[PDB]
Symmetry: C3
Amino acid sequence: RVAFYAGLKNPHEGYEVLKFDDVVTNLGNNYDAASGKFTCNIPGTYFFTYHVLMRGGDGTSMWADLCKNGQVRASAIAQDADQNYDYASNSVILHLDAGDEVFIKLDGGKAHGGNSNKYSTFSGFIIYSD
Amino acid sequence: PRVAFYAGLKNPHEGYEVLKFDDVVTNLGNNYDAASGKFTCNIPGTYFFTYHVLMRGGDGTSMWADLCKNGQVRASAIAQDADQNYDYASNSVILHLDAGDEVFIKLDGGKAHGGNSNKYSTFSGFIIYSD
Amino acid sequence: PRVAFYAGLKNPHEGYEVLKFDDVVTNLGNNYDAASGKFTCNIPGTYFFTYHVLMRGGDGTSMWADLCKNGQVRASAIAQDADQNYDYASNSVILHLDAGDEVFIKLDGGKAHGGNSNKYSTFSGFIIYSD
C-alpha cells in the first residue's frame, strides 16, 4: 500500500526540484516533503501525475518535468503571453527499483505555491509490485 | 471492491455551486449520484479522483474549479485567458475516505462549459485500496 | 492481470488523424500498439486512460484532441490561445472494454507537438478491474 498526494505551500522558481509540502496522503511514507522526492521502497510499476500552476503576472512561460533519478520521463509547459495563470501538467507510468527517486523539477519559470489551497500538486501510487 | 465512475458535464454552469456531472459513462458501485453531483463513499479506503473542467469560450477570462471532500477544499484549479480563449481547470487527488464521505467538484467563480455528449468537462474516480 | 502502458509522441502531427504515440515507456500486457496508436483490449474489464497533447506554439491558435473507443468520442479536449502560445488538450476517462475494443487519441483539427525524448505529449492507461 503506497500512495501519496501533496500540494505546494510556497512559491518556487528557476530549475529546482519542487518541494510539495502540504501533505494530504502519504501511505507507506515514501514521499518526502522536505525534499519533494518520492523514494521507492516497494519495487514495481507506479502511476504519477502532476499539476503545476504557473505564477501569473510576468515571465510568460514555465516548464515542469517529472524526473526519475534525474532523467526526464515527462515534460510540460505552461505559457501565456498576457501573463495569465496556466498549468504545466502530465502523467506517467514507470518502473521503480528500490532506491529510485521520482520528483518534479522546474526547467525555467515561476510556479505558484499556496499556503493551503493545493493549486499545485503531485501524486502517485503503486499499480503492481514486482 | 468495484467502485469507479466517469461522468461528463451536460449543461453549462456559472454559479458558486456543486458541478452536476450528469453524462454518466461509468458508475461501478453506483456511489456517484448525477442528481447531487457527489460521490458518496460507502467502502472506507484510498481513492483517486481527477477532474477536467473547460472554461466557457468567448465569455469571460477566469474560472475556478475545486475538488472538495465533504465541503472542504482538497484541490484547486484555475483557467485563465485574457483573450477569452478556452482553457481548462484541472487537477487530481488521492484521498482516504470514510463511509459517508462526499467528494465533488465546486465551481468557484467563472463560467464552465457543459454539453450533450462530447464530454469536454469531466469528473472521474476509483478506489485504490480497501481499509 | 498486468495491463498498463505509457507512451510519448516522438513526431509532429496535425489535422484529423489517430495520434500514434511511439516512444513506448511501459506496455505491460502488450496491448498498446505504437504502429497504429491504438490500445486493443485483450482482458475484458474496467480501464483508466489519460492523455496530454501539446499544441504546437508559434503556428496556430486552436487544437482539438479526443479519446475514442472504437469509432466513438468518449472524452474531448481543446487547446486554444490567440497569441499562438503552447497549451494542452488533456482529459481522462474510465471505460468498460470488451475484448477487441480499441481505444486511442484522435486529433480533431490543429497542430500537435512531438519530439524525441522529452515526452511533452503523452497517452497512458491501465486496467482497474477484470470482468
